[PDB]
Amino acid sequence: IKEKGKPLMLNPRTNKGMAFTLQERQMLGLQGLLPPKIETQDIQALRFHRNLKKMTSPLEKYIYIMGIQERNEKLFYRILQDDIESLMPIVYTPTVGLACSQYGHIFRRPKGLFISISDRGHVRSIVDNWPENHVKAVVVTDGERILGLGDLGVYGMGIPVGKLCLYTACAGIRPDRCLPVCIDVGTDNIALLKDPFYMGLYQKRDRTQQYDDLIDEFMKAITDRYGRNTLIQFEDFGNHNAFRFLRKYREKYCTFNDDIQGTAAVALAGLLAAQKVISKPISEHKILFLGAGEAALGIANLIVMSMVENGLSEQEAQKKIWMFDKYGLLVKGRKAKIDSYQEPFTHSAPESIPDTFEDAVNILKPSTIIGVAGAGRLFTPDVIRAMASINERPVIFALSNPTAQAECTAEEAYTLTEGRCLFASGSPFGPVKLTDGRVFTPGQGNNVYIFPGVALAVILCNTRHISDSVFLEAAKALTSQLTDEELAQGRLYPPLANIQEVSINIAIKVTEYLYANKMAFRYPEPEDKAKYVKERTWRSEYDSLLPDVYEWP
Amino acid sequence: IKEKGKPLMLNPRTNKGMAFTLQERQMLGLQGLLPPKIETQDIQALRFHRNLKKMTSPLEKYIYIMGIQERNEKLFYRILQDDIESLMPIVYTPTVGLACSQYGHIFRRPKGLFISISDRGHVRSIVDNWPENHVKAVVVTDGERILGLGDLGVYGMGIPVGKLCLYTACAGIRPDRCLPVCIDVGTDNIALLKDPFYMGLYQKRDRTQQYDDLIDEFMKAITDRYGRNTLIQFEDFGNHNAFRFLRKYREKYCTFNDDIQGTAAVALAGLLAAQKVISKPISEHKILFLGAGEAALGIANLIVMSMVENGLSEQEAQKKIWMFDKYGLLVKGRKAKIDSYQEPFTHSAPESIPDTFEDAVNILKPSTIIGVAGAGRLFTPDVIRAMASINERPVIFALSNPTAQAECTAEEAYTLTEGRCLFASGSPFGPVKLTDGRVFTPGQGNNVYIFPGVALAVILCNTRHISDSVFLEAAKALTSQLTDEELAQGRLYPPLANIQEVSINIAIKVTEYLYANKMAFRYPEPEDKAKYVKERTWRSEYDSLLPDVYEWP
Amino acid sequence: IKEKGKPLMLNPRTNKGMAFTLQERQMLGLQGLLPPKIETQDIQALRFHRNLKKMTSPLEKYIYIMGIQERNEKLFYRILQDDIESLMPIVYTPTVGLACSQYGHIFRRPKGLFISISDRGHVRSIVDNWPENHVKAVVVTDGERILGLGDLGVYGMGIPVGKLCLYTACAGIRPDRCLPVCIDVGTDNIALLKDPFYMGLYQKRDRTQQYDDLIDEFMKAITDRYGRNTLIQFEDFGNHNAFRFLRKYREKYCTFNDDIQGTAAVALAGLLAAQKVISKPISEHKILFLGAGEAALGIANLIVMSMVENGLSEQEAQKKIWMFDKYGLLVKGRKAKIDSYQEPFTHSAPESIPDTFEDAVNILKPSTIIGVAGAGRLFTPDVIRAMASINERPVIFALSNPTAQAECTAEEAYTLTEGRCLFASGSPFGPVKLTDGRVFTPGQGNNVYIFPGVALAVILCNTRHISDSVFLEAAKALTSQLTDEELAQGRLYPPLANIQEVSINIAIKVTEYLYANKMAFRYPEPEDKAKYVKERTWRSEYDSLLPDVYEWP
Ligand SMILES: NC(=O)c1ccc[n+]([C@@H]2O[C@H](COP(=O)([O-])OP(=O)(O)OC[C@H]3O[C@@H](n4cnc5c(N)ncnc54)[C@H](O)[C@@H]3O)[C@@H](O)[C@H]2O)c1
Ligand SMILES: NC(=O)c1ccc[n+]([C@@H]2O[C@H](COP(=O)([O-])OP(=O)(O)OC[C@H]3O[C@@H](n4cnc5c(N)ncnc54)[C@H](O)[C@@H]3O)[C@@H](O)[C@H]2O)c1
Ligand SMILES: NC(=O)c1ccc[n+]([C@@H]2O[C@H](COP(=O)([O-])OP(=O)(O)OC[C@H]3O[C@@H](n4cnc5c(N)ncnc54)[C@H](O)[C@@H]3O)[C@@H](O)[C@H]2O)c1
Ligand SMILES: NC(=O)c1ccc[n+]([C@@H]2O[C@H](COP(=O)([O-])OP(=O)(O)OC[C@H]3O[C@@H](n4cnc5c(N)ncnc54)[C@H](O)[C@@H]3O)[C@@H](O)[C@H]2O)c1
Ligand SMILES: NC(=O)c1ccc[n+]([C@@H]2O[C@H](COP(=O)([O-])OP(=O)(O)OC[C@H]3O[C@@H](n4cnc5c(N)ncnc54)[C@H](O)[C@@H]3O)[C@@H](O)[C@H]2O)c1
Ligand SMILES: NC(=O)c1ccc[n+]([C@@H]2O[C@H](COP(=O)([O-])OP(=O)(O)OC[C@H]3O[C@@H](n4cnc5c(N)ncnc54)[C@H](O)[C@@H]3O)[C@@H](O)[C@H]2O)c1
Numbered sequence A, B, C: 001i002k003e004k005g006k007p008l009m010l011n012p013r014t015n016k017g018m019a020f021t022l023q024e025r026q027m028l029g030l031q032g033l034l035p036p037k038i039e040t041q042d043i044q045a046l047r048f049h050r051n052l053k054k055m056t057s058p059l060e061k062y063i064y065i066m067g068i069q070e071r072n073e074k075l076f077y078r079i080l081q082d083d084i085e086s087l088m089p090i091v092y093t094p095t096v097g098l099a100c101s102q103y104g105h106i107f108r109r110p111k112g113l114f115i116s117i118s119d120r121g122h123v124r125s126i127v128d129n130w131p132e133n134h135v136k137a138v139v140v141t142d143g144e145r146i147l148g149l150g151d152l153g154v155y156g157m158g159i160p161v162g163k164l165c166l167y168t169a170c171a172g173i174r175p176d177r178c179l180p181v182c183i184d185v186g187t188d189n190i191a192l193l194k195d196p197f198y199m200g201l202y203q204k205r206d207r208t209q210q211y212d213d214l215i216d217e218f219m220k221a222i223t224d225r226y227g228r229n230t231l232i233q234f235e236d237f238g239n240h241n242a243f244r245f246l247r248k249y250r251e252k253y254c255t256f257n258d259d260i261q262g263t264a265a266v267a268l269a270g271l272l273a274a275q276k277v278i279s280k281p282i283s284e285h286k287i288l289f290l291g292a293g294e295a296a297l298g299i300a301n302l303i304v305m306s307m308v309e310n311g312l313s314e315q316e317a318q319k320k321i322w323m324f325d326k327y328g329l330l331v332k333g334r335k336a337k338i339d340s341y342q343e344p345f346t347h348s349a350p351e352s353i354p355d356t357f358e359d360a361v362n363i364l365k366p367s368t369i370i371g372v373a374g375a376g377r378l379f380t381p382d383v384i385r386a387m388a389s390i391n392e393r394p395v396i397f398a399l400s401n402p403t404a405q406a407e408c409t410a411e412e413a414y415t416l417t418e419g420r421c422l423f424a425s426g427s428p429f430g431p432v433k434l435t436d437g438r439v440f441t442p443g444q445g446n447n448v449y450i451f452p453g454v455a456l457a458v459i460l461c462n463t464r465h466i467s468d469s470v471f472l473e474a475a476k477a478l479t480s481q482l483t484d485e486e487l488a489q490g491r492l493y494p495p496l497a498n499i500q501e502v503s504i505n506i507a508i509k510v511t512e513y514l515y516a517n518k519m520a521f522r523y524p525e526p527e528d529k530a531k532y533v534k535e536r537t538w539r540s541e542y543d544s545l546l547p548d549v550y551e552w553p
C-alpha cells in the first residue's frame, strides 16, 4: 500500500481497527489515533457477535453487519466466515429483499457503482471513477426484477452488493476485484416514484433504444478499462432483457446471467440428488413448472441437457417438460403468447385444458413440481396432497424468493405429504419434525451454491466465454458432494455450513473442466488444479502492513 | 512529513536524493528507486562544485544552481552556505539581472505565485492555491523597476525569487515560510510585448484604479490566509507606487519597502563607517545624490534622522542634502516637477545652476556623492577627479545595480583619487591594487546586508508594523560589526563571507530593540535575545525522515 | 488522473508547463502557480530548440534533453519527434556511452529501477515500489558489457533508459508502460571502485549462484506484479550470461536479448539490401566476422536461417561463415577454446593459418566482412584495400559502438575502395563526398531499427514467447522498406528520419506474422492489422485533463 496516517483508518479495505500492531501504529503514523489497547481479530469478532445477539430484528442486524464492511473489510468477512449458516438469512435472502424494499430509508454509506440513463455517452468517465484498478468480477442490475419483489429501481443495488459478498465469503474471490453495478433507467414503481427517499431517477423505466445503447456503452466501458475477459454476471433483469442480453453478449464478452443459468445448475443438482433416492426410470419422468420465465426456462434446458446426455433425444426430453404460467398451461395455439424459448416446451393441448395449477397436476400427473413464479403460495395443500397422491415420493421445489413469495413451506411440504416428498426451497426453512418424531432437514435450492465457485474458476482460468455445459458440470460437482448420510435426513444439497469448501470444490472441478475443453486461457496449465485453486483464495486473516526492512551486508 | 514513495523524491522540499539513508529508503518505499549507493551531503556538494567549475558563463551557472532549488532544497542551501561570497554574484546581482532580462528564454520550472490583473476579484482563490500553509514572509513585485533595468513585466519574478533565497541563506528563515509573488498588470516594454516567450499579459501596464484595487485585494487575501502580521516586503515597484503603497499600508499591515528602506539602512551603515575614518564635523557635511527616486529619498531620510539624533535640527539636517535627477539639480522653482518627498531637499538655487553633475560637484563641493540613478557611468573620471580635489577623503557611493548601471567602478574610484576615496558600490567589485602596491578591498552597499536580518527579527517578534527607526537601528547594528582591521583595508562593510553571522547579529539587535520599544508581540519575552534567535534559525543539514519507533513497557 | 494542485506539475508524466489551459489551471488548482501566459506545445519546443542550438558539446546537450523527460514527458517526446535524426547521436550512440562513462558525475535525478545483489530475497518489495502498475516492457541490464566500453557497473543504467526512449520515440509505446532496470551485483572496473561518485556497490562483480538466484528472483518478481508475458529485453550483459539467460528463459517468459537477436535482424536486413545490388550467387558467398560473441553469433545464425530458407542446407550454410576472434580464426583443433555456439562455424583449418585479420581476409578472401568486436579500428586500410581488391563490390560492416570502437569510418571505407564498397556502421557517420564529386550516404546498422517495432507487435499481440523466426520476418519487413533511389545513394537501410513509420510498418508485418503463426493471444484477431496498430500508438500531443462535466436532462 502507498498511504500512511489516518487514511489507513478511513479506508475499510486497509483499516484493522485496534488490531493494528504497535509496530504498524508507530510505523504508519497511527499511534495516538487508536486506544492504547491492541486487539486481536478474535476479540473484535467477539465484540460483534456479542453486540449482534442483542439485536432483535433482522434488518437491524443487516444494517449492523453490512456496516462493518464499510468499516473493516477483513473483520467483516471474518464475521461472515465465523457463521455463514446463520448470517446467510440476514445478509442474503430473505432479509436482503426486505432491505432493498427500503434501501433509501436505511441508507448510510453508498456501495457499488451507479450508472443512470442520464449519463449515456459518459459511461466511461464514470467507470474510470471507480477506485479499484484491477476488477475481475462485475455483478450488474437495473432492478426490474429484484427477487420476487418486482421492480425496485435503484433500491435494488442491495442485490449485487449482497451477491458479491457471497463471492468472497464462499469462493474467496478478492473483494477489491469485485464491482457491483446498478443501471438506473427509471422505475415503473409508482410508490417509489412519489417517494422522497427514492435514490434513483424519478421517471418511468425507459424502454427505448436509448436503453440498449446504455447497456452496450456499459459492457464496452467496463471491458475497455478492466479487460475483455472481465466476468460480468447479470442479475435480476426483466425476463425480456435477461434473455436478449445473454444471447447478445454471451459470445462477445465473458458473461452469464445468474437467474437463468445459475438457477439451472442448482435445481439440476438437487433434482440429480433426488434421482439418487427415487431411481425412477428416465422414461416415466414428467416435470411441471409453475412459471415459464428466466429460471423455469433455464432449469428446463439444463435438465433436457442431462437427459440428452443420458440417452433421450433432445426432442423426447423436451416432451417430458410442461410449464404453467400466469395465463395457464403452455400448449400449442393458446391465446396467450409463447416465446422462442418456450416453444420447445409448448405441446399439443392435453385432453382437458387445466384452469388451475391443481388441475394441471391432476391432468398431467407430474413426478416433479417446480415453482418459479415468485407469486406466493401457489402450491396449495391441495396441490401438495395431489402430488402426494399421484407420487409415492413426489419432488416439490418451492424456489421463489423471498420466503413470502415462496410457493409453500418446508412445513406444509413434509407435513401434507407425510414426510414422503423430496423438498427444496429457494429460501431458508428450518427442519421439520413430524408428529411421529421424524425430522426432515430441507435443502436450499439457491444459485448461491453455484455462482461463487463458478465465478472463481472462470476468473482463475481466464476463460473467454461461459458455455452452458459449464453449468451442467457445476451441477454435477455440487451433487457429487452430497453424502448418503446428508441425503439420509432429507437434504438434497450439502450443508450450508460447508458452503465455502463446496464452492471451492466446484471451482476446482470446473477449472479442470475448462482446461480439458480448451476454454481456459491461463498459461501455463496447472498440473494440480486442486492446489492451484486453494493456493489462490483470499483469506480474512489480517495481513502485515509493515515495510520490508532488512540489513545490507 | 505525511507522504511516502516517489512523492518524497518529487518534492524538493523533502528530497534528499542519494542521501536518503538505507533505513529511510526501506521504510518510506524508496528502495529500488535510487542507486545502491548512499551518499553524504558532503559528496553531493562536491559533485555540484566539481560540475559548476566546468561551466564558462554565469547565466549557465545561475540556471544550474537555481535548478538545485527545484530539486533538493537542503542541498541547494548547503551549496550557497559553502561559499556565499562567490555564489552571490551568480544567484544574485549582477547575474540575476541578466537572468531576468531573458527569464522567458531560460524558463524550466516556475517559481513563486503569479497574480495577473485578469484574476481581479478572484485573487483569494489563487492565494489558497499555494501549497504551503504557514507563510510568514512575502516578497512581491510588479516588475516595473527591476533593478536599473526598468520594466521587465512578469520577467521580473526572478527578483522576488532571489531575495527570498537570501532570506534563508543569510538569516536562516525557513524556505517554506516564504512566498515570492508577481503582480502582472501588463508591461510597457515594447520588446517583451513583441516577444513570443514573454510570460505575462500582452498588454500595456494598467495604471487605473483597477490596479490599486488589485494590490489591495492581494494584501487582504494574503493576510486572510496567513495572518495580519505576515511580512510583506515590496520590491522593485515604480517610484510613484513604491511610496504610495508604503505610506498607504505601513500602518495597516506589517510591510516595508526594500528599495526605499532597505537601501537607506545600508547606505547609512556605510556612511557611518566612513565617518569613523574621516570624523568630519557634522556642520561641514554636505551630500549630493545623483538621482532622486526611491533609494535617494529613502537614504536622505535616514541620514537626516541620524543627524537629528546627533544634534542638528531636521530642518538644517535637510539643508545639508542636495539632489540631482535626470532634469538636473532639484532647486525651488525649477521647471521639472519636484514632489512631496523631495520638497525638503529642493533648495533656493545656488549662485550658478549646474548643467551637468560635474558642475554640481564643483558649485556644491559636497563631501559625499551618492549615485543611485541606475543610468550607467555618470560618475565620470572628471566627477571623480573633481571630488578628490575638493576633498582629502571624498566619499563615493555607486549603488545602482546591476554592474552595467553602476555610476563607476572601484578601479576608477580608487585609482582616480589615489587611494584616498572611501568607496562602496551596489554590485560586486574585486580588490584593487594600485601601481604603488596599495590594495583596496571595496565594500558592497547592498540592502542584502539589511533585509535578511531585519526580516528574521520582525517575524520572530510577531511585530505588527515596521517603523523607520527600526532601519535606523539596523544600520547601527550593521556598522557596529565592522572591525578596525577590515576598516583598515577599505571595507566600509563587514566581509560578505560573514553575511550570515552579520545578519543574525543584526537580527538580535533589532529584536532587542523591538521588545525594548513595545513593538514585539511574541509572548513570553525571551530573557536572552541572542540565544532565542540562534535557537530558531533554519539549518541546511538533512533531517531524519524516519518515524518515531520505540518499544512499550 | 486522480490528483490536483502542485502534484500535477511535479509529476512529469502529467506536467504540461505553461501548456495547461486556463480552464485546467482554474479547475485543477494551478491558477497562480504558473505565469499568466498560456503557451502551446509548439512554442515550448521552440524555446528548447533555440536553447539547444546554443549548446556546444553533446553531453551538455544530452543532459539538457534528458532533463526535459524528468520535467515534462510529452514535451520530451515532442522534441524527439521533431527531429529524431539529429537528436539520435545525442540521446543515443555515441553520446549515450559517453554519458554512461560518467553517469555518476552528471547525475541529477534518478531514472529506472535499481536492484542490487544486497536486496537478494526482497526483490519483490523493490518492484512493488515502482510507481507504475501496468508495465508491459522492461529493458534490463547489469552494466557488464556496456556498448564496446565494457564493465561500467551501475553507471550503465543510461543504456536501458535510452533504449526505452526509442521504444516510445519510434514505436509509440506508452512511456508509463516501460521499465528500465539495472542489476548491481558489483563491478570489476577498478577505476569505478575507487571513484567517490560511483553509484553502485563498491565490490567486484559477484559471479556465484547468488547471481543466478537474483536474476531469477527478478524474473519472477516482475511477472508476479505485471504478468507472465511482460516483455523483458536483456541488454548488454556479458557474453557468457547473455546466452545463458536467453537459453534459460526464452521459453519460460516473454523475453529476448537485444544484442543477440536484435543485431541479427538489422544486419541481415542490411545484407539482404546489399544482395539487391550485388546479386551474387548464394554459392559464391563467404562471410568473415571480426569478433565471435553475442552479435556475431546472433547475426551468423540468422544469416544461416535465411540461406537454408533459400536452398542451402544448414550444414552448407554454416560452411559459408568464418569467425576471427581475439585469439584469431576459429578453426578445429585450436588452443583457444570454442563453445557450443561457435562450434558450427569452427571449420577445419584452411591451408595457411592467419595471424592477423588482414591475413584471414587474404587467406579466406571473403565477400562480406562484419566487424563486431568493439575493439577499435581493426578494419585497417590494408584490410579495406584488400577487400576492394578481392571483391568488385565488397560489403563492409563496422558495427561496433560507440564510434571510437568502430572498426573503421565511412570515409575510410568509401574512399579506400573508391566508392565501390557497401558500407553500414552501427554508429552515425556523415555522408562521404569523393574527390570525383560522388557522394555516399552510409546506412546505420543499429538494432534501433528493430527492437522498437518488434517490441510493439509483441506487446500488442500478447505473444508469450519470442521465436527467432520473428526476427527473420522483422529483417524482411525492414529491408522491404528500402527504396530503389534510397539504395541508389548507398543506403542499405531506410533513412533514419523515417525511423518511426518504418518501426510501425515492421510492427504490423510482425503482428500479421505472429497471428498467422498462432503466436499472438490477443482476442479477438483484428481483421485489419495495419489499422489495429496505428490505432494504438502513444502520441506526443497534450491530452486534456479537464473532468467530464455535462448537463443532465
Ligand atoms: N432459488 C433460486 O436460486 C432463484 C434464482 C432466480 C430466481 N428465483 C425466483 O424465481 C421467481 C421468478 O423469477 P423468474 O426470473 O423466473 O421470473 P420471470 O418474471 O421471468 O418469470 C416468472 C414466471 O412466473 C409466471 N407467473 C406469475 N404469476 C403466476 C401465477 N400467479 N401463477 C402461475 N404462474 C405465474 C409468469 O407468467 C412468468 O412466466 C422469483 O421470485 C425469484 O426470486 C429463484
Ligand atoms: N497493483 C496491481 O495492479 C497488481 C498487484 C498484484 C498482482 N496484479 C495482477 O495479478 C496477476 C498475477 O498473477 P496471480 O498469481 O495473482 O494469479 P494467476 O495468474 O494465477 O490467476 C489468473 C487471473 O486470476 C486472478 N486472480 C487470482 N486470484 C484471484 C482471486 N483470489 N480473486 C480474484 N481474482 C484472482 C488474477 O488477477 C489473474 O488475472 C498479474 O496479471 C497482475 O497484472 C496486479
Ligand atoms: N505543521 C504546522 O503547521 C506547524 C508545525 C510546527 C510549528 N508550527 C508553528 O510554529 C509556532 C511554535 O513556536 P516556535 O518556538 O517555533 O516559534 P516562536 O514562537 O519562538 O517564534 C515566533 C514566530 O516566528 C516564526 N519562526 C520561528 N523560526 C522561524 C524561522 N527559522 N524562519 C521563519 N519563521 C520562524 C514562528 O512560526 C512564529 O510564528 C506555533 O505558532 C505553530 O503554529 C506549525
Ligand atoms: N545597492 C542597493 O542596495 C540598491 C537598492 C535599491 C535600488 N538600487 C539602485 O538604484 C537605482 C535607482 O533606483 P530608485 O529606486 O532610486 O529608482 P527611481 O525610479 O525611484 O528613481 C530613479 C531616479 O534616477 C534619476 N535619473 C535617471 N537617469 C538619470 C540620469 N541620467 N542623470 C541623473 N539622474 C537620473 C531619475 O530622474 C529618478 O529621479 C537602480 O539602478 C537600483 O538598482 C540599489
Ligand atoms: N488504469 C489501468 O490499470 C488501465 C487503464 C486503461 C487500460 N488498461 C489495460 O489496457 C487494456 C485495454 O485494451 P487497449 O485498447 O488498451 O489495448 P489492446 O487490448 O488493443 O492491446 C493489447 C495489449 O497491448 C497493450 N497496449 C496497447 N497500446 C499500447 C501502447 N501504446 N504501448 C504499450 N502497450 C500497449 C495493452 O496494455 C494490452 O495489454 C486492458 O487489458 C486493460 O487492463 C488498464
Ligand atoms: N550496432 C549494433 O546494433 C550493435 C548491437 C550489439 C552490440 N554491438 C557492438 O558489438 C561489439 C561487441 O559486442 P558483443 O556483444 O558481440 O560482445 P562479446 O564480448 O560477446 O564478443 C566480442 C568478440 O570480439 C572479440 N575480440 C575482442 N578483441 C578482439 C580483437 N582485438 N581482435 C579480434 N577479435 C576481438 C572477442 O574475442 C569476442 O569474440 C560492441 O562494441 C558493441 O558495441 C553493436
Ligand SMILES: O=C([O-])C(O)C(=O)[O-]
Binding pocket: A093, A146, A147, A148, A159, A236, A258, A259, A400, A401, A426, A446, A447
Ligand atoms: O438473487 C437471488 O438470490 C436469486 O437469483 C433470486 O432472484 O431469487
Ligand SMILES: O=C([O-])C(O)C(=O)[O-]
Binding pocket: B093, B146, B147, B148, B159, B236, B258, B259, B400, B401, B426, B447
Ligand atoms: O533588488 C535589489 O537588490 C536592489 O533593491 C536594487 O533594486 O538594486
Ligand SMILES: O=C([O-])C(O)C(=O)[O-]
Binding pocket: C093, C146, C147, C148, C159, C235, C236, C258, C259, C400, C401, C402, C426, C447
Ligand atoms: O545498445 C546498443 O546501442 C547496442 O546494442 C550496442 O551494444 O552497441
Ligand SMILES: [Mg+2]
Binding pocket: A147, A235, A236, A258, A259
Ligand atoms: Mg436474482
Ligand SMILES: [Mg+2]
Binding pocket: B147, B235, B236, B258, B259
Ligand atoms: Mg530592488
Ligand SMILES: [Mg+2]
Binding pocket: C147, C235, C236, C258, C259
Ligand atoms: Mg547493447
